[PDB]
Amino acid sequence: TYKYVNLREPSMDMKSVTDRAAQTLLWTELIRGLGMTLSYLFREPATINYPFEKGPLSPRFRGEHALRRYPSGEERCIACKLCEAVCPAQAITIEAEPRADGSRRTTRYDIDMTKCIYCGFCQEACPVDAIVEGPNFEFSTETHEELLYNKEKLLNNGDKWEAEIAANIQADYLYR
Amino acid sequence: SRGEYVVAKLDDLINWARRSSLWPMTFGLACCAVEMMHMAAPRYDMDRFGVVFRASPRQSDVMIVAGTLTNKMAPALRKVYDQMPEPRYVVSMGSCANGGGYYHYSYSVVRGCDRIVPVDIYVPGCPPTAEALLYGILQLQKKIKREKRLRIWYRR
Amino acid sequence: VKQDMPPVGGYGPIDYKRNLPRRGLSGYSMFAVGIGALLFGYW
Amino acid sequence: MNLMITLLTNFTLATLLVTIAFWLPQLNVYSEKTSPYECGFDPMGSARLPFSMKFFLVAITFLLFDLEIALLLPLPWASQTTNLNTMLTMALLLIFLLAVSLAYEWTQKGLEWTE
Amino acid sequence: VRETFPEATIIKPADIFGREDRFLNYFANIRWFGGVPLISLGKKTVKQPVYIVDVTKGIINAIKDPDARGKTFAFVGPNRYLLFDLVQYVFAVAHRPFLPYPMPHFAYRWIGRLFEISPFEPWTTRDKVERIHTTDRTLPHLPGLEDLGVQATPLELKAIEVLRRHRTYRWLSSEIEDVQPAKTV
Amino acid sequence: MFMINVLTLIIPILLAVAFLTLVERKVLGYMQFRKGPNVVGPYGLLQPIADAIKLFIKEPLRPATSSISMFILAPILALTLALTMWIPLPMPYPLINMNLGVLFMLAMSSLAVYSILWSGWASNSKYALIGALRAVAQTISYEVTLAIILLSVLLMNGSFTLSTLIITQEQVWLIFPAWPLAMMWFISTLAETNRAPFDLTEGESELVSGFNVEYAAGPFALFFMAEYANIIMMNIFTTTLFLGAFHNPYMPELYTINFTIKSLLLSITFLWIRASYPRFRYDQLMHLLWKNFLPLTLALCMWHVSLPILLSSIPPQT
Ligand SMILES: CCCCCCCCCCCCCCCCCC(=O)OC[C@H](COP(=O)([O-])OCC[N+](C)(C)C)OC(=O)CCCCCCCCCCCCCCCCC
Ligand SMILES: CCCCCCCCCCCCCCCCCC(=O)OC[C@H](COP(=O)(O)OCCN)OC(=O)CCCCCCCCCCCCCCCCC
Ligand SMILES: CCCCCCCCCCCCCCCCCC(=O)OC[C@H](COP(=O)(O)OCCN)OC(=O)CCCCCCCCCCCCCCCCC
Ligand code: SF4
Ligand code: SF4
Ligand code: SF4
Numbered sequence: 001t002y003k004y005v006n007l008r009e010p011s012m013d014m015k016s017v018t019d020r021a022a023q024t025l026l027w028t029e030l031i032r033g034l035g036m037t038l039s040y041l042f043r044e045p046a047t048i049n050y051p052f053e054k055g056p057l058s059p060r061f062r063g064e065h066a067l068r069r070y071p072s073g074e075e076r077c078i079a080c081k082l083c084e085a086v087c088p089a090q091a092i093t094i095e096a097e098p099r100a101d102g103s104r105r106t107t108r109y110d111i112d113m114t115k116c117i118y119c120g121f122c123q124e125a126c127p128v129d130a131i132v133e134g135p136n137f138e139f140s141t142e143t144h145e146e147l148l149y150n151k152e153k154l155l156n157n158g159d160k161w162e163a164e165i166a167a168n169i170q171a172d173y174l175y176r
Numbered sequence: 177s178r179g180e181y182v183v184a185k186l187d188d189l190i191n192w193a194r195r196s197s198l199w200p201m202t203f204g205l206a207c208c209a210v211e212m213m214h215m216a217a218p219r220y221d222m223d224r225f226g227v228v229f230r231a232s233p234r235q236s237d238v239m240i241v242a243g244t245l246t247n248k249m250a251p252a253l254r255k256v257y258d259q260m261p262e263p264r265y266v267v268s269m270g271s272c273a274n275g276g277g278y279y280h281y282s283y284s285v286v287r288g289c290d291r292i293v294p295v296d297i298y299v300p301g302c303p304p305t306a307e308a309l310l311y312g313i314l315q316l317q318k319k320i321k322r323e324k325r326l327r328i329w330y331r332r
Numbered sequence: 333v334k335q336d337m338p339p340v341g342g343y344g345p346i347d348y349k350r351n352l353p354r355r356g357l358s359g360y361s362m363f364a365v366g367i368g369a370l371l372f373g374y375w
Numbered sequence: 376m377n378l379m380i381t382l383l384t385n386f387t388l389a390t391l392l393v394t395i396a397f398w399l400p401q402l403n404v405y406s407e408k409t410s411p412y413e414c415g416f417d418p419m420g421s422a423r424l425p426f427s428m429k430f431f432l433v434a435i436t437f438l439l440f441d442l443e444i445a446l447l448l449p450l451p452w453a454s455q456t457t458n459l460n461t462m463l464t465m466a467l468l469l470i471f472l473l474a475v476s477l478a479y480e481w482t483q484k485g486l487e488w489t490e
Numbered sequence: 491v492r493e494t495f496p497e498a499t500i501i502k503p504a505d506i507f508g509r510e511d512r513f514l515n516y517f518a519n520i521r522w523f524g525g526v527p528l529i530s531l532g533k534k535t536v537k538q539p540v541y542i543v544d545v546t547k548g549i550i551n552a553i554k555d556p557d558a559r560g561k562t563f564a565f566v567g568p569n570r571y572l573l574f575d576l577v578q579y580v581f582a583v584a585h586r587p588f589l590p591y592p593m594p595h596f597a598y599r600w601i602g603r604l605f606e607i608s609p610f611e612p613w614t615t616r617d618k619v620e621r622i623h624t625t626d627r628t629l630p631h632l633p634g635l636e637d638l639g640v641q642a643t644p645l646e647l648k649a650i651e652v653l654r655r656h657r658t659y660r661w662l663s664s665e666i667e668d669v670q671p672a673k674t675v
Numbered sequence: 676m677f678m679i680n681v682l683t684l685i686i687p688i689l690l691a692v693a694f695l696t697l698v699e700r701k702v703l704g705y706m707q708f709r710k711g712p713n714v715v716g717p718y719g720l721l722q723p724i725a726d727a728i729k730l731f732i733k734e735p736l737r738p739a740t741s742s743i744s745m746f747i748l749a750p751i752l753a754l755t756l757a758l759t760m761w762i763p764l765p766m767p768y769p770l771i772n773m774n775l776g777v778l779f780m781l782a783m784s785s786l787a788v789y790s791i792l793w794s795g796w797a798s799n800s801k802y803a804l805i806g807a808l809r810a811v812a813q814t815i816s817y818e819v820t821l822a823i824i825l826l827s828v829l830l831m832n833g834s835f836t837l838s839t840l841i842i843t844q845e846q847v848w849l850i851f852p853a854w855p856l857a858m859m860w861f862i863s864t865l866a867e868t869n870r871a872p873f874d875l876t877e878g879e880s881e882l883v884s885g886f887n888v889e890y891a892a893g894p895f896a897l898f899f900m901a902e903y904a905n906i907i908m909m910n911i912f913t914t915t916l917f918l919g920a921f922h923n924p925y926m927p928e929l930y931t932i933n934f935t936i937k938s939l940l941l942s943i944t945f946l947w948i949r950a951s952y953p954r955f956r957y958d959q960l961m962h963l964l965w966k967n968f969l970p971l972t973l974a975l976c977m978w979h980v981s982l983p984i985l986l987s988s989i990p991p992q993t
Contacts, residue, residue: 015358021361026366030952032355037706037951047221047710050310055219089271090276114275116287118302140299140312142319144290147274147300192726202879218709223700225714226722232884233412234736234891237729252415258407261734261891263401292709366854372985373852377677378715378762378771384681389751389897396893397735406509406655409739411800412888422740422799430812433961436816444822447976448778451830454983455992466980475971477965486965488958659740659799 057135059168061174062120064136065111065149066157066165068129075155076130079106083122083131091115106151114146117121124176134161135168183326192264194237195320196226198313201236203256205243208270208303212242215306229311233259238316241293242269244279245286257293265320267312269296277302429488436480442475492562499558501549503565504626507645507652508542514649516614516622517580526581526600527593529623532573536625536675538601541643544635551638564632567653568642570675575621579645579672583653585661646671684770685758692903693723699946706950733892741889745797750890750897753790756783757901760908765838765915766810767922777835780912781822784867787905788814791876793896795886805806806886809957810869810876816961817866820968824860827976828916829852829984833990837915843990844919856975857917859968865914865948866960868906872952873960880954910941928971 010020023029048055069075079096095108123133134157141147149157158165187246204212216222216229225328230236233256245253268289276287289295296319299312411418428434447469456462480486491498507514520526529535545565550559571579574590581588593601599616606615635642650666657664699721702709712719737743760783763769763776773779788810795807829835831852832843843849850857852967877885911934916978920933955963983989 001831019359022362026362028356033951040708041702041706043708045221045705045710046218046708047224048219050307050312055305055307057845089280107256112275113300114271114298115241115277115280116302117271117278137301137305137308138311140297140304140315142297142315144274144288144295144298147298190728190732192727193732196725197724197729218707221704221709222709223704224712224719226725228700230884231879232888234889235884235887235895237733255407255410258405259410259412261408261736262403263733279456299885369851369854373847373849373854374982380677381681381749381762382755384678384757385685385755386751388685388758389754392731392754393747393751393894396731398872400732400734402734404655404734406739408734408736409655411738411740412883413801414883418733418801422801422804426804426808428808430815430958430961431849433965434811434815437819440819440984444819444826448822448826450826450980451833451835452992454830454980454989459984463981463984467977470977470980474970477969477973481966486962655739657739659742662740 003136045078051147059171061135061168062118062123062133064132064134064139065113065116065122065154065158066132067109067151068132068158068162068165075105076128077106077109077126078104078130080127082125084126086121086125087116088119088121089115089117091117107173109110109151109154111149111154113149114144120135129169132165132169134165136161179330180327183330187324187326189279190321190326191321195298195317198225198227198238198317199203199230200227200238200240200267201229201233201256201260202229203242205245205249206270206272207274208242208272211303211306212240212269212309216307217306220306220310222310222313225313225317233257234261236260236266237263238267239291239293240267241273241295244272244277245262245289245292247284247286250286250292253289254292265316266293266295266297269309269312269315270304271300271302274298274300429490432480432485436476436485439476440473443469443476447473454479497559499552499560500562501545501552501565502563502632503540503545504567505537505539506542506545507539507648509652511542511652513539514580514652515656516618517577518584518586518653520533521581521584521586525589525591526577527591527598528573528577529593529595529598531590531592532577532623534625535573535623536570537573537576538567538570539645540565540625540635541645541648544640544642547640548635548638551640555638558638562632563638564629565635566626566642568644569672570626571645571672572675575672579649579669580653582669583649584656585658585664586656680770688758688761688904688907689900691907692900693727693920695903695907695942696899697723699949702943702946703950708948727896730892730896735893736889736891738889740799742799743798745793747894748902749790749794749797750894751932752793753787753901754897756787756790757904757908759783760787760905763837764911765841765842765976766934767838767927769837770916773836775835776837777825777829781825784821785814785818787901790898790901791886794890798886798889799826800889802882802884802888803886804896806876806878806882806888810886812957812961813866813869813875816964817863820859820964820972821863821867822974823969823972824856824863825916825974827979828856828860830979831988831990833992840915841919841922845922847919850917853872853917853979855971859918859972861913862968863964864909865945866964868909869902870906870945871949872955874954875957875960878954906945907938910945911938914938914941 008160060147067075067077079094081094081096084090084092084094091112093108093110093112094106096106099105118133120133123129131154136157185211204210207230213219233239237260239257239260241253257266264287268274272279272285273289276282279285286292297316298314299309301308304312411422447466450466453462453466492500505513515587548563552561553564577590578588598619602614602616602619606612606622647666650669654662690964697712700722703717712722715721715725737746760780761927762771763773763779768777780860791810792807795803795810828849831849840849869876879885882888887898890898914934914937918937920930920937923931
């Protein structure tokens with residue numbers, strides 16, 4: 001259940017003593033390290049040519065947030081505030097009121113992207129699959145206030161990436 | 177005429193020479209430092225783009241704030257930023273350096289590194305992926321390309 | 333049901349022990365090569 | 376004459392690059408940029424304090440062995456003599472005395488660093 | 491401005507000294523070129539410089555005060571110095587050798603002409619020369635920093651903060667009080 | 676037409692210094708499973724130009740607590756010492772034929788240390804003083820063994836003239852009768868040039884940037900090209916010492932191309948050594964050249980004094 005690492009006593013034989021003297025004087029293991037590095041020179045380097053190549057990803061990937069809609073135009077969120085209550089970083093602020101046709105919808109849905117820890121609890125606490133964490137990750141901005149998303153930005157992200165989030169949810173939803 | 181052409185060419189030359197020779201300093205604090213050195217791994221290899229680490233602040237160009245900036249760390253970060261010679265650039269990594277992230281309401285966490293240093297590029301994520309950090313570096317390069325310093329000097 | 337599973341016979345063998353080639357010649361061969369080069373250069 | 380021309384050419388090549396590295400770019404010099412660098416924190420004392428050295432004996436014997444090898448460099452010309460046996464004996468004796476000094480330092484723990 | 495905006499507040503500072511100023515830094519950088527030339531030894535002109543933070547506080551209070559609309563303030567420092575002992579105090583703070591020498595007015599203008607041909611920012615010019623050797627006028631009829639609730643801070647408490655970066659390594663850690671203060675009028 | 680000769684010597688060596696920085700970055704990429712700079716130009720041929728232009732438009736940054744005279748003087752001395760290092764090197768005709776060229780390299784090797792020492796001392800820093808004293812210890816470690824190795828090798832040449840070193844090995848290579856001296860010479864020049872595994876001065880791990888931890892751009896570039904010119908000429912010195920090529924007085928370009936290929940292969944092996952081994956301690960190096968190299972070198976010096984007397988093979992001094 002255990003092994004004695006580094007308890008190997010040397011051998012006192014004169015032939016092996018001369019071999020160790022030759023290794024000492026002529027630097028055998030140093031040339032061994034040189035040869036290993038030389039063999040490592042002649043391999044294919046693992047550099048992918050970004051931005052013309054992208055690293056592999058999975059359909060469960062957690063990137064930029066988005067708000068989805070039903071396949072008729074109606075938005076999926078119903079202002080149930082489960083995402084803002086399960087959010088570990090308190091990055092979600094929701095204010096709601098009934099709209100002109102008496103449907104329970106939001107008037108304010110803000111996600112602070114600089115507080116969000118990108119753990120994906122909101123996309124799994126949503127009972128209607130409204131909020132999703134899409135596959136977008138190249139969305140760095142030049143200003144702090146550009147990373148404070150309101151409802152219009154989230155709806156624009158949903159309309160921008162629906163063609164991908166629908167396919168990813170279709171590929172993944174049998175595991176959830 | 178000719179002077180505007182000359183200063184535009186000189187601006188293009190110095191912008192290319194500055195954006196193709198970004199030397200970031202070895203500075204990390206937390207998870208996001210591990211992701212930054214994963215960006216420096218052979219898969220992505222930022223050394224292709226002329227981006228090579230230089231440990232001293234005097235020989236660096238861009239400072240990458242990757243990690244959580246606590247109250248005990250803020251004077252050190254500010255001092256190291258001040259010792260960096262002009263021109264200098266700042267890239268914010270992760271939610272901790274952006275707005276505090278998980279620890280925004282913490283008693284000993286500075287809510288965003290923009291309260292201490294002037295930040296050019298904000299890279300969001302927790303951690304932002306190595307591709308995301310490479311995207312932020314390329315965005316900073318494209319921002320450097322759009323500088324009109326000698327044009328502004330000639331016009332003023 | 334459908335799930336991720338190992339195959340019926342299990343996966344193949346996976347090595348976990350040290351495997352160093354222990355290459356090179358004997359010390360006497362290296363010393364003989366060095367002495368031969370020395371004497372040829374001297375002559 | 377050519378050596379002084381070469382040395383002057385090298386010197387005014389070297390001092391041309393420094394002089395164009397001090398006046399060309401835009402400067403923003405404050406009373407924080409030029410502070411000593413101590414890994415982000417204020418230093419605790421001056422940098423002119425006595426920085427104690429442990430290898431003093433090796434430095435003194437470096438002086439003595441540098442002079443021993445300074446005595447030893449006329450050997451290629453001294454091999455062109457007629458009294459060859461005496462030259463060979465004195466060269467061997469000088470080198471043997473050098474080795475004796477080194478061995479006496481080795482056996483007396485002089486090469487080992489203090490503390 | 492007064493004729494086109496009848497409710498405009500006009501603020502007239504005397505001379506600002508601060509960390510990134512061009513008043514004390516100019517005097518502390520003139521030492522490169524020689525021995526600080528002046529006009530008539532710099533003992534015919536009187537200056538009363540004002541701290542930058544006090545000017546900022548006066549501006550903020552003039553923004554907040556409803557009675558500052560239409561006024562014309564005059565922001566001046568609490569003490570008046572001649573130019574000669576002002577430059578002497580600047581060099582004594584910087585612990586630099588102070589060897590003044592006179593220069594005629596026509597000779598100084600030609601010097602300012604030579605410096606102002608640079609395509610970059612000129613080190614000095616004839617206008618800077620004439621403003622350096624111009625006595626600061628007194629306007630008792632105009633309200634000052636005391637009418638806006640700002641207490642004027644003298645040059646002796648901020649000159650070291652301004653000019654500590656101009657010292658060598660030998661005199662970098664000298665304290666507040668080991669400099670003889672300037673003589674007023 | 677001597678100034679044209681001087682210019683055509685001093686410009687290509689710094690051009691090759693910049694392209695050695697390129698090649699070193701590419702090889703140091705390619706051994707560690709990745710690539711070098713290949714984005715700026717066609718296979719990254721414009722990276723040294725971009726680095727050089729960048730370093731000369733950045734802030735100079737002379738410290739306040741530093742003595743400015745020695746602070747400016749040290750990089751000038753470093754670059755000038757690296758530039759006058761190359762003068763008596765025969766490729767196959769040196770710029771300045773000298774009776775005693777080897778001692779000139781030794782004296783200028785002694786002088787070039789002082790740039791590192793004064794740049795460490797002038798910049799008022801503790802890390803800079805640490806790097807300076809490490810350079811002092813490194814020099815007192817290597818210098819004796821370097822001088823005595825070169826003495827015991829030149830005894831078969833007959834004189835200190837470097838051009839005679841071409842003639843003295845036109846039959847067989849000098850690496851054959853002095854192969855142990857060749858290995859210890861290679862290790863000693865690895866230690867001389869402050870390259871891995873004997874860096875110990877510009878350590879980015881034990882220190883932050885060594886003696887130039889306060890040097891901003893421009894002045895720092897002087898140390899960079901000084902060090903790279905040093906490593907190129909030291910490989911060239913080794914190539915002349917032990918790997919002399921065939922020289923035709925009618926066609927010197929044959930010797931030039933043979934010598935250039937050999938020195939390039941030596942520099943490739945130098946960067947190969949750089950990316951293979953951990954860095955030594957700065958006292959383990961002192962116990963290396965003194966306890967292991969010096970006794971064997973004294974024995975080899977006895978052997979190479981007695982051997983020309985032994986075989987009646989005393990070389991001519993003319
Ligand atoms: C330029 C041409 C090629 C040059 C050759 C080198 C190229 C390849 C370089 C490989 C990588 C080297 C990286 C740096 C390594 C630094 C460490 C190092 O080398 O330390 C030295 C090491 C040190 O060994 P060490 O560090 O293990 O020391 C142990 C010390 N104790 C025991 C106290 C703990 O080896 C030597 O010092 C040996 C020097 C060379 C000896 C040559 C002997 C020649 C044969 C003599 C005769 C033998 C036969 C018997 C007698 C017969 C008599 C007739
Ligand atoms: C009065 C008349 C003269 C007026 C003064 C001006 C004289 C000329 C000044 C130098 C040249 C100015 C033009 C610089 C390039 C302008 C075009 C440009 O920016 O091209 C961009 C392109 C790279 O595009 P990028 O966006 O990086 O793409 C990412 C990769 N997919 O870039 C490229 O593909 C490569 C760009 C190479 C730039 C030129 C080569 C380097 C500079 C050489 C000259 C200066 C240095 C000389 C030696 C100094 C000492 C070493
Ligand atoms: C403040 C800091 C310092 C700032 C200033 C720095 C200046 C440069 C410093 C680096 C250079 C130092 C040079 C020191 C002397 C070197 C002598 C030398 O190189 O001699 C080589 C050579 C020997 O000639 P030989 O082998 O006899 O063959 C000729 C026979 N036909 O000789 C010849 O071939 C002879 C050529 C003419 C020799 C003229 C006499 C020497 C001139 C010395 C000038 C002053 C050097 C000052 C160095 C200061 C160093 C701190
Ligand atoms: S991913 Fe997590 S931290 Fe981000 S908004 Fe959703 S629940 Fe909050
Ligand atoms: S959990 Fe879903 S339905 Fe409920 S408030 Fe959040 S996004 Fe809307
Ligand atoms: S932003 Fe997230 S990954 Fe980065 S340091 Fe903070 S907790 Fe770690």
